[PDB]
């Protein structure tokens, strides 16, 4: 079973996406997003991306959606909408799981599934490379090259964040 941990995680990722995509109250949506973020971190870690996946755990889960939650709390709704609360939400939730199951089964049964692209049912372990990175974390060096090579990216991103602060101030002015 440990042979397809990545696939199990990807299925959980899709399930969380169906959860927050069916639009329950933003509380449960936040829960689905949090679960999906953790699971994406798991997949990234499995592929060797410890730092990148951990970034989602902190700057995405404990970041963008940590305020998403703080926001919903300020705009409190009368009732916590759940999947079963609206027949459509529950129906779409079930259909989404069913859709995943259909493609999953087809991919496994039909060695080569083709929804919009062509996918092979072989385990993800196949695609991995047999090279050695030596005394290095390739992800770490690539990310740290943002200061040595990606100076232009640094400039543009910093300017965007400053203008984002100014923009948020201006939008929340309200005159």
């Amino acid at each position: 079973m440990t042979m397809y941990i990545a696939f199990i995680l990807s299925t959980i990722f899709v399930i969380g996406f169906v959860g927050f995509s069916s639009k329950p109250s933003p509380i449960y949506g936040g829960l689905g997003l949090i679960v999906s973020g953790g699971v994406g971190c798991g997949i990234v870690l499995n592929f060797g991306g410890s730092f990148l996946g951990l970034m989602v755990f902190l700057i995405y889960l404990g970041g963008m959606l940590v305020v998403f939650g703080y926001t919903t709390a300020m705009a409190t709704e009368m009732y916590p909408e759940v999947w079963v609360s609206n027949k459509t939400v529950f129906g779409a939730f079930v259909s989404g799981l069913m859709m995943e199951f259909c493609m999953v089964y087809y991919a496994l049964k039909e060695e080569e599934v083709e929804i919009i692209f062509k996918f092979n049912g072989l385990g993800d372990w196949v695609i991995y490379d047999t090279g050695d990175s030596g005394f290095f974390s390739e992800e770490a060096m690539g990310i740290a090259a943002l200061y040595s090579y990606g100076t232009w990216l640094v400039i543009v991103t910093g300017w965007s964040l400053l203008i984002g602060v100014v923009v948020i101030m201006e939008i929340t002015r309200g005159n």
């Binding site: 692209f117 984002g164 923009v167 939008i171 005159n175």
Partner: protein, 347 residues
């Protein structure tokens, strides 16, 4: 909004478009689009109204979806080619997704529904920026990826945009909505020639930009957002409404006005590629645009609508602010037809 902050936001919008038109790496092009959106949103809400907030929200949602689809297309092209360079796109599905995203950014139908609403919500100056400057970046991106573009999808979007722009304008008595529908139709005209010859798209974009700049500056000078408020202008500033009539006739494409040359050259290039039915339908469908232009002209200048007694007060005063480029924009929008062969410069 503090004027220094306003200048910084406008420069950020222009810098985003410059990054879009300057970068050879897809990630940076998407970054430029993100900067354009981030800087644009507060600019749309310079004057705080519930309508301004609603327009900003609609525009943000639409542009955010477009950017997300664009980034997915970039990621797919990376997956199948491993190339970040803006060049031929090596996956047809990525090409279709990118085309939909860029069309949504341009307001091409059937992604047009947000253009009239956003234009009506925002002020005339924000509308000018939205309908002139914002079009530059997606059109640049499409021109760079023109070869990969599937001609059928682009042509269908262009024809639908022309049809819908012509249809919507007939029903509108709000000047901003009329301008938005005209913008939709002209965007369809520009994107029609994109698969065939990009220089024609650039020429049409320049002519359209001059005409819309002139029209919006005339509206700002007349401070009219409705047909009747513009009708009142003949009593105050008859020259303004006369020049508005001339610019409207140009926008309709009537010869010998400058508005004729983009349509003429587009028809030429399409015919050279054996496209005969499509140019014919586009030219005929432009008559709806021409019709509501003519109705606006009847309301404004050709016919004298009733004024109000309080206008005698405005007679004594004069316009304080002068828009320097308005006369040259009018001249270019109306009398540049004898100078088409200079269309080899942008070439």
């Amino acid at each position: 909004m503090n004027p220094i902050i306003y200048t910084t936001l406008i420069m950020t919008v222009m810098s985003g478009t410059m990054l879009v038109m300057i970068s050879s790496h897809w990630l940076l092009i998407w970054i430029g689009f993100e900067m354009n959106l981030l800087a644009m949103i507060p600019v749309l809400m310079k004057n705080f109204n519930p309508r301004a907030t609603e327009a900003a929200t609609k525009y943000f949602l639409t542009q955010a979806t477009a950017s997300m689809m664009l980034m997915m297309a970039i990621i797919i092209n990376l997956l199948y080619s491993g190339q970040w360079t803006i060049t031929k796109m090596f996956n047809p599905v990525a090409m279709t997704m990118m085309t939909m995203a860029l069309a949504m950014k341009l307001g091409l139908s059937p992604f047009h529904f947000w253009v009239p609403e956003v234009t009506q919500g925002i002020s005339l100056q924000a509308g000018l920026l939205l309908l002139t400057w914002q079009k530059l970046a997606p059109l640049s991106v499409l021109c760079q990826i023109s070869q990969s573009i599937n001609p059928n999808l682009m042509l269908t979007m262009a024809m639908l945009s022309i049809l819908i722009g012509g249809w919507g304008g007939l029903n509108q008595t709000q000047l901003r909505k009329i301008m938005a529908y005209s913008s939709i139709a002209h965007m369809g005209w520009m994107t029609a020639v994109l698969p065939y010859n990009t220089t024609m798209t650039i020429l049409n974009l320049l002519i359209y930009i001059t005409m819309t700049l002139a029209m919006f500056m005339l509206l700002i000078h007349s401070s009219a957002t409705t047909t009747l408020s513009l009708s009142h202008t003949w009593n105050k500033m008859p020259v303004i409404t006369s020049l508005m009539m001339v610019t409207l006739l140009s926008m309709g494409g009537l010869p010998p006005l400058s508005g004729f040359m983009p349509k003429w050259m587009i028809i030429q290039e399409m015919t050279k590629n054996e496209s005969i039915i499509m140019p014919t339908l586009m030219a005929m469908t432009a008559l709806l645009n021409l019709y509501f232009y003519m109705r606006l002209a009847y309301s404004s200048s050709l016919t004298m609508f009733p004024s109000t007694n309080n206008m005698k007060m405005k007679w004594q005063f004069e316009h304080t602010k002068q828009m320097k480029l308005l006369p040259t924009m009018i001249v270019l929008s109306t009398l540049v037809l004898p100078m088409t062969p200079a269309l080899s410069s942008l070439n």
